[PDB]
Design a protein around this ligand. Structure first.
Ligand code: 5SJ
Length: 112
């Protein structure tokens, strides 16, 4: 397991996950200016831009740490937003579509 091919794969996987976020509602931190009470019960906010920064800082050296932050994007959104909102359903769909992306990516990593 070499570092450079692995990060190439995480970069490709991150792009495939962002592609599932057609609304771009997960690509940047939740704007605290518009959601001022957001950090009341969300102890670790997460988004795809932050994941890209963490990736390039070598903070993802295994698949599970990368997948954990993706799951955080999903779980934070399910936690904060009511079930009858667009945001909540978008997180459900991201969980479903992103899960398929991640399983295939992990198979490619397990070949390495
Ligand atoms: C510009 C104002 O838009 C929002 O209020 C807003 C913008 C982005 C958001 C969000 C709210 N809440 C979330 O849970 C996730 C989906 N991101």
């Amino acid at each position: 397991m070499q570092l450079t091919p692995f990060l190439i794969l995480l970069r490709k996987t991150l792009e495939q996950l962002q592609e599932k976020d057609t609304g771009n509602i997960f690509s940047e931190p939740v704007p605290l200016s518009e959601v001022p009470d957001y950090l009341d019960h969300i102890k670790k906010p997460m988004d795809f831009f932050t994941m890209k920064q963490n990736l390039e800082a070598y903070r993802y050296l295994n698949f599970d740490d990368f997948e954990e932050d993706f799951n955080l994007i999903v779980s934070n959104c399910l936690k904060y937003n009511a079930k009858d909102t667009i945001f909540y359903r978008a997180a459900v769909r991201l969980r479903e579509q992103g899960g398929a992306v991640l399983r295939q990516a992990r198979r490619q990593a397990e070949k390495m």
